[PDB]
């Protein structure tokens, strides 16, 4: 995060981008500066996806861990069959 420093948009920019619910793209821009720009777009998309996935962080005390989803090995599979959970319930745990 430092020293990078922070996203002014600016087409340099930095890869994380670990913000939550950002009112920064709009926001001012205002507008973008006079840079050649090619990506920009791809690195912003990867950084936003990584920022959201890290921005989960919590809600895993509310999980209810993930499952095998469908029926597949599960490398034991010689003394009981395998069945996955259809994810239709409410993962809340209270």
């Amino acid at each position: 995060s430092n020293p990078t420093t922070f996203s002014v948009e600016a087409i340099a920019a930095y890869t994380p981008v670990a913000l939550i619910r950002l009112l920064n793209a709009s926001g001012p821009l205002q507008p973008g500066h006079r840079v050649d720009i090619a990506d920009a777009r791809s690195i912003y998309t990867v950084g936003a996806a990584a920022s959201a996935a890290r921005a989960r962080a919590n809600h895993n005390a509310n999980t209810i861990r993930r499952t095998a989803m469908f029926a597949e090995t599960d490398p034991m599979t010689w003394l009981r069959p395998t069945v996955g959970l259809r994810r239709t319930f409410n993962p809340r745990i209270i």
């Binding site: 619910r21 998309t45 989803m69």
Partner: protein, 538 residues
């Protein structure tokens, strides 16, 4: 990237035709067609062949600019008997034959007929369904990852307008029938989906009924030698996975195939593209197959089809009978703009619910995701609130783990083959059939032009490949459309020449005219279209 190609076609087509085409005037009655003033009369000699004028000394497919040469008369094979022109084979005869075929077979109850007809004529259909259908892209893993969100979305769309969602593409009603059919959805919705699927299987059983088994020549089964919807060489108008191409390439094997995927021949079929290596502006011929679940992706692992061969037949039957019988020439096939769709899906404002607290359900509390206090502009909550649908926090959070599997971009696939072994003499092998398809393409039911909450052409751009899916009104979504192009495409169905032409394709203009100018019924229209799709091979 299929935008520049469509723009080049629309620029060249504004002055390519200086007169009315002779193959679109199918509204002539028999007395006017027969009369000697008709210039098309002298080119109708053999009932199994179409005659036209063609450029000389050109090897199809040729370059983008058509080379200058003297015109010569070429011929092609009328594969279907529904391709016989409408003055020679009328609409009333086709509808009476369809009534004859559907004597005791399965019919659709009027409830699902009314609901599907309402959702096909809906102009306020929410675009969030189109974005969800584009981003799931027909993978079973993504659909079962999004089960809670799709259940809440379908329920919210059902018990507010009494219409049926996710009906445009075929890889949704299988997944709804198989997975969300045990009671997650209400009783009427699953009955509607099951009735649509029952009608599709009844059409397939009718195909099997009117053929004779045990007569297979050169690795072609008897139904594929009789019908077209059971022919594995012919492919669906839109594709979501590379299984149909594998079945077509292994099925024909003697009728000389040639498939062109955005440049050089052949496909590469590399699956499991994720966030690290997406490369939206890919100029290669790499197609995204998706992740098969029971196995490993790898890199040296050979590709396998997801589903059985019956899935391709049912998809062809659905897209080629049920969709044009309901939409009646109003739906159009288009690709998607993934480089604008994917950044718009990364904005979710699911709040921070503290521990030892209940998750809010109603949207009247400040902690709900669709409460107005967290209804920030330019997000996905505004997309869901414009559609007036209620979803929870976790239903919006499931897209994050949808994002591990993604699609790069849409592309246009032009396959070609010789006619089948039944009608392949020494002179019909030079005649070839050219038909097009859209990899990762979408179909919208009806087009809205006056909905200004989303700017036009933001996600979808019209690239139509069928006479059935001709869209004279969807072309306003394309960038740079004038009134001259609109009145030019109103009378002639705009098909780009890099996706096949009308006279060289399988599905031609007269079956589209039959599906767009018949007012009989909805069951008898489907059975009449099925009686249309029978080969004229001896």
């Amino acid at each position: 990237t299929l935008d520049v190609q469509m723009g080049r076609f629309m620029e060249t087509w504004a002055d390519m035709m200086p007169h009315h085409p002779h193959w679109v005037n199918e509204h002539l009655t028999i007395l006017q067609f027969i009369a000697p003033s008709n210039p098309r009369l002298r080119f109708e000699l053999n009932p199994a062949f179409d005659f036209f004028v063609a450029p000389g000394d050109v090897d199809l497919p040729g370059p983008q600019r058509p080379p200058e040469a003297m015109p010569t008369v070429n011929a092609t094979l009328r594969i279907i008997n529904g391709n016989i022109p409408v003055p020679l084979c009328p609409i009333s005869f086709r509808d009476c034959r369809g009534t004859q075929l559907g004597l005791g077979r399965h019919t659709m109850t009027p409830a699902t007929i009314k609901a599907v007809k309402d959702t096909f004529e809906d102009r306020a259909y929410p675009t969030i369904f189109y974005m969800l259908e584009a981003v799931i892209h027909g993978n079973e893993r993504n659909f079962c990852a999004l089960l809670r969100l799709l259940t809440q979305c379908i329920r919210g769309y059902w018990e507010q307008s009494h219409r049926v969602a996710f009906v445009n593409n075929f890889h949704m009603l299988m997944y709804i029938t198989t997975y969300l059919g045990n009671g997650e959805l209400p009783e009427v919705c699953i009955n509607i989906y099951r009735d649509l699927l029952q009608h599709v299987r009844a059409l397939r059983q009718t195909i099997t009924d009117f053929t004779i088994q045990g007569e297979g020549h050169n690795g072609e089964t008897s139904e594929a030698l009789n019908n077209i919807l059971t022919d594995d060489t012919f492919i669906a108008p839109i594709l979501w996975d590379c299984d149909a191409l594998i079945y077509r390439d292994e099925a024909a094997r003697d009728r000389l195939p040639a498939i062109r995927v955005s440049g050089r021949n052949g496909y590469q079929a590399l699956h499991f593209v994720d966030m690290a290596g997406h490369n939206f502006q890919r100029r290669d011929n790499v197609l995204i197959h998706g992740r098969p679940v029971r196995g490993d992706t790898g890199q040296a692992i050979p590709i396998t089809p997801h589903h059985d061969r019956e899935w391709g037949i049912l998809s062809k039957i659905y897209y080629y009978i049920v969709i044009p019988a309901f939409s009646r020439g109003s739906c159009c096939t288009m690709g998607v703009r993934y480089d604008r769709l994917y950044p718009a899906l990364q904005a979710v404002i699911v709040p921070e619910i503290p521990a030892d607290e209940e998750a809010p359900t109603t949207p009247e509390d400040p902690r709900h995701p669709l409460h107005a206090h967290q209804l920030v502009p330019n997000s996905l909550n505004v997309y869901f609130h414009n559609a007036h649908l209620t979803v929870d926090g976790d239903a919006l959070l499931t897209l994050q783990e949808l994002m591990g599997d993604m699609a790069e971009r849409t592309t246009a696939i032009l396959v070609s083959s010789a006619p089948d072994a039944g009608a392949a003499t020494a002179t019909t092998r030079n005649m070839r059939i050219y038909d097009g398809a859209l990899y990762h393409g979408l179909i919208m039911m009806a087009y809205q032009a006056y909905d200004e909450t989303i700017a036009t052409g933001t996600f979808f751009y019209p690239v139509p490949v069928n006479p059935l899916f001709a869209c004279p009104e969807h072309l306003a979504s394309l960038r740079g459309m004038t009134n001259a192009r609109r009145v030019l495409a109103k009378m002639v169905p705009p098909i780009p020449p890099f996706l096949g032409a009308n006279h060289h394709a399988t599905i031609r203009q007269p079956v589209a005219y039959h599906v767009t100018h018949s007012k009989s019924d909805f069951n008898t229209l489907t059975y009449s279209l099925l009686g249309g799709y029978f080969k004229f091979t001896p």
